[PDB]
């Protein structure tokens, strides 16, 4: 995944 912090 990209990640929720991007």
């Amino acid at each position, epitope marked *: *995944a*990209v*990640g*929720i*912090g*991007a």
Partner: antibody, heavy 118, light 113 residues
């Protein structure tokens, strides 16, 4: 070795709360996000949400808002998921998984079984 | 969010035969750069999910070359050119491009012998 150690099986009464823990080992806790995944025979795998330990920022799928709340403790390198006002549909197995930004769910926790029953 | 529809729900396969699992997304799952965070996971009972494929076609470390992934548009496929006994379990596609992230419904692979 990388390790994600989850807490053991729970029996929780309906309408109560429980906190699940996931302790990271063998890597820097703040360098990865922590994600939570629900598993049931009826709905398979469901993404619950995630937390960035370094900042405390969180995100959730809409149906888990108000049901799950994620926190992280940098001092003990342990992520937490609190499940609140439990019903029988909260009986499941819950996993944690780490994520480096732009990478993948490479290491998973052992899994925690929760049974909501009076 | 993004709906991931997987087919079939159960796949009975003979040992040594070929297996193909399809995953479709309700909307584009291309991230803003043109990269696609489509992943495949396997779960055997009593065990944790295990990563197989990332970014549509790349094998995770230690995954055999008979397992491969591909996809164009909103259609994605996981393929096993020669099913072996240890491939049994439930396969899940996973969309990691758009929050909230979503899984497919799962495909149970069952081996014939």
């Amino acid at each position: 070795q990388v390790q994600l150690q989850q807490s053991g099986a729970e029996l929780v009464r309906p309408g109560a709360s429980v906190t699940l823990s996931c302790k990271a080992s063998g890597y820097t806790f703040t360098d990865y996000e922590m994600h939570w995944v629900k598993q049931t025979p009826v709905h398979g795998l469901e993404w619950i949400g995630a937390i960035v330990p370094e900042t405390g920022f969180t995100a959730y799928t809409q149906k888990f808002k108000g049901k799950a709340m994620l926190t992280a403790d940098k001092s003990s390198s342990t992520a937490y998921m609190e499940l609140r006002s439990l019903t029988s549909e909260d009986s499941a197995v819950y996993f944690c998984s780490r994520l480096r930004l732009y990478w993948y769910f490479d290491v998973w926790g052992t899994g925690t079984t929760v049974t909501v029953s009076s | 969010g993004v709906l991931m529809t997987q087919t079939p729900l159960s796949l009975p396969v003979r040992l040594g035969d070929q297996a193909s699992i399809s995953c479709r997304s309700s909307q584009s799952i291309v991230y803003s750069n043109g990269n696609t965070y489509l992943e495949w996971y396997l779960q055997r009972p009593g065990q944790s999910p295990k990563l197989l494929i990332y970014k549509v076609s790349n094998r995770f470390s230690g995954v055999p070359d008979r397992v491969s992934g591909s996809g164009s548009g909103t259609d994605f496929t996981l393929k096993i050119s020669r099913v072996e006994a240890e491939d049994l379990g439930v396969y899940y596609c996973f969309q990691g491009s758009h929050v909230p992230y979503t899984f497919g419904g799962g495909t149970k692979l069952e081996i014939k012998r």
